[PDB]
Symmetry: C3
Subunit: 156 residues, 3 copies
């Protein structure tokens, strides 16, 4: 299991070449801190693929979702968040929007996103899994470890 | 009277063509949730017109103010907010800025805006009432119903 | 000593030509309100110069740091913030990013910045002191007085 560590401490440990994400995210989950092995999904205003991924058991994993930063539909709501938590995921990093914000703060999982929108995403299943996602100058690679807190996100 | 309903539930009810506003607003009022018939005012760094509108009795109405999103002056402060609350308005959606943020959280009315600025708006009265206002892909039409919560805004 | 006053009240006192900053900052410190004589430092992803400035005794001063608004490195963390507080500074206005957000809320000093990033700044000492800094339509001049609260910042 991966033990969480403040991003600032990781930076002190890693040095000048630390992989720190510059993108400013908002916190939505019941946990402000989380760390775990990275899994990825790229999609667009559709969440059937990411939901299937989060349906699988996870050893405290972190799912990075690249929804092109769209604020038009909610990629994650309280249904998918609870599902993720129930299967073992420790955190979700959403390059897009979420819904049920009031409820998300009450789910024991980390959740970062750019904003909110009650409009639902489609469920065609379109998208790609296990791809590399580059956000804020950092590339999220499947298998690498993500650490997230109020300061930012570090990938090791 | 219009009974509030979470925007996410309205979306579930309405379907894919739901009129959901994509613009990200900050919450400032004592109420995080509100719903009511829409009234509108378009102006620019001037709030004499919107104040006169909010001076009239309202059956739990919602005033949508298009101030072109300016963050230069406060369209609404604790004086106008309290006035609105005292005359029956349930919520104010400000496409601009507000002042007295610390006090606004203590006024029993919903308030959304893009930001804050202590600089005051002028009081010439310039502007237009009852016009259609399109923000974040949604057109706020006088008479339609607005629902607002932590996720967004729905117009029915 | 300078006694704090709400920015809205200062605006009422000063009138239409009040110097009010339009730039939207996030609050990070233990104090949401502060006021004091202005000192300045311009730098870029380097904080050795501003740290030396904050190392000097201050009569409740306010340090305005222009880091070009970079969100790539933290200009101020809990070490520099505590140092500033320990030497007498009442507030820091950072046109850039900070780190140790969770800890900053527990330091008795005002702190405003554009965002966060755990990545550290360099310590070459590069930069300029006592320069005029113009942000959001307001010029921060050394010697002038800055007042900061939840609504904005006024310079007198």
């Amino acid at each position: 299991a991966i033990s969480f560590r403040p991003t600032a401490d990781l930076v002190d440990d890693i040095g000048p070449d630390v992989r720190s994400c510059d993108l400013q995210f908002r916190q939505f989950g019941g946990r402000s801190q989380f760390a775990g092995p990275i899994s990825t999904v790229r999609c667009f205003q559709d969440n059937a693929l990411l939901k299937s991924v989060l349906s699988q058991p996870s050893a405290g994993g972190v799912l990075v979702i690249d929804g092109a930063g769209s604020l038009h539909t909610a990629l994650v709501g309280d249904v998918i968040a609870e599902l993720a938590r129930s299967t073992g995921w420790t955190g979700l990093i959403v390059h897009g929007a979420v819904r049920d914000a009031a409820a998300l703060r009450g789910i024991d999982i980390g959740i970062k996103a750019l904003g909110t929108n009650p409009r639902k995403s489609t469920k065609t299943g379109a998208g790609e899994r296990d791809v590399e996602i580059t956000l804020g100058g950092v590339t999220f690679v499947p298998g690498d470890i993500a650490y997230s807190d109020d300061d930012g996100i570090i990938v090791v």
